[PDB]
Structure 1
């Protein structure tokens, strides 16, 4: 009932409490938290063993991965506020629609979400249904229909309704 960004991106991206591998031969942990592009698993559990504070073998708790996720969004939007097109309209919505933006940011990337120039600015004038249906006309929406429909519904309502 009390949803935050980290949980909704656990619904859509996926949370793993053990170290895995990103799609290019690179370990990860949690929700897309990259450590290094090296094969040294000891360097893996050493970067993890130095970022968490407890020395473990690559397994953490669900509340310690949320820490690293909050770091990842605190740097992600540190990048958003340096992108000229993502900066304006983000400063215009409510917290949950901003999370709906950071989700796509972490899904495709800064220039990826920047491409929806027309779709982004109708959110500024708060044209929820129009920007929603225009966002539904995307290859993004077609290659992963489910998640995109969730994000677009939160762009519409500005609520966590679609994730319950």
Structure 2
């Protein structure tokens, strides 16, 4: 297991524009295109992202390209964020992946707002952090995925992604 395999499980792979859990146009391995309700706006974003006139379908190679870019961007967003960088630096490898996963799903600003959870993670108070992380819109809207990420923070193992 690694961050790529973890996010591939959590995000799936679809080669045509689809709506994500929040109803937003997405493609590939969880590549958000836009929050606009306009499908044409989403197709314009896709064409710009891929560099060709795509009319909404991409190849697996193109999906994996966006995924590489998106994982790299999540890591770089963590490291440039004054709230997230110290937490990331304090964590072991498995828990670093859990934090990247959250940023991939919700964005840097959203995760950076989990102030009390982030402090508990820095303090290595893993059971307390796990309880606090579940008191969130995130956990209520995507409970199975949030449970997997939270188990990863609680235990520091990949156990929640084994059997998947």
- One fold, TM greater than 0.5? yes
Tell me, which stretches of 5 or more residues in structure 2 are unaligned? none
8 Å CA contact retained: 1:18, 1:60: yes
Which structure: greater strand fraction? 2
Q: How many residue pairs end up in the alignment?
A: 162
Bigger Rg over Cα: 1
Q: CA deviation at 1:87?
A: 1.0
Q: Which runs of 5+ in 1 are unaligned?
A: none
Secondary structure, aligned partner of 1:20: strand
Deviations 1:34-70 (A, max 9, x none): 5689999999999989988999987666565334312
**Structure 2 residue corresponding to 1:110, chosen from 108, 111, 117:** 108
Take 1:42 and 1:114, find their aligned partners in 2: how far apart are those partners?
A: 32
Q: Normalising by structure 2, what TM-score?
A: 0.73
Per the alignment, in what secondary structure is the counterpart of residue 121 of structure 2? coil
The answer as to whether partners of 1:132 and 1:155 remain within 8 angstroms in 2 is yes
Partner SS state of residue 19, structure 1: strand
Q: Per the alignment, do residues 154 and 91 of structure 1 end up closer, same or farther by CA in structure 2, a change over 3 Å counting?
A: same
Are 2:124 and 1:126 aligned? Answer: yes
Query: What is the CA distance between 1:148 and its match in structure 2?
Result: 0.9
Out of 77-86 and 42-51, give the one that drifted further: 42-51
Return the structure number with greater helix share: 2
The answer on whether the counterparts of 2:70 and 2:104 sit within 8 Å (CA) in structure 1 is no
- Cα root mean square deviation, aligned: 3.5
Q: Using a 3 Å threshold, how does the CA distance of structure 1 residues 21 and 150 change in structure 2: closer, same or farther? A: closer
2-structure distance, mates of 1:37, 1:143: 17
CA 1:133 to 1:48, structure 2 compared with 1: closer, same or farther past 3 Å? closer
TM-score (norm 1): 0.73
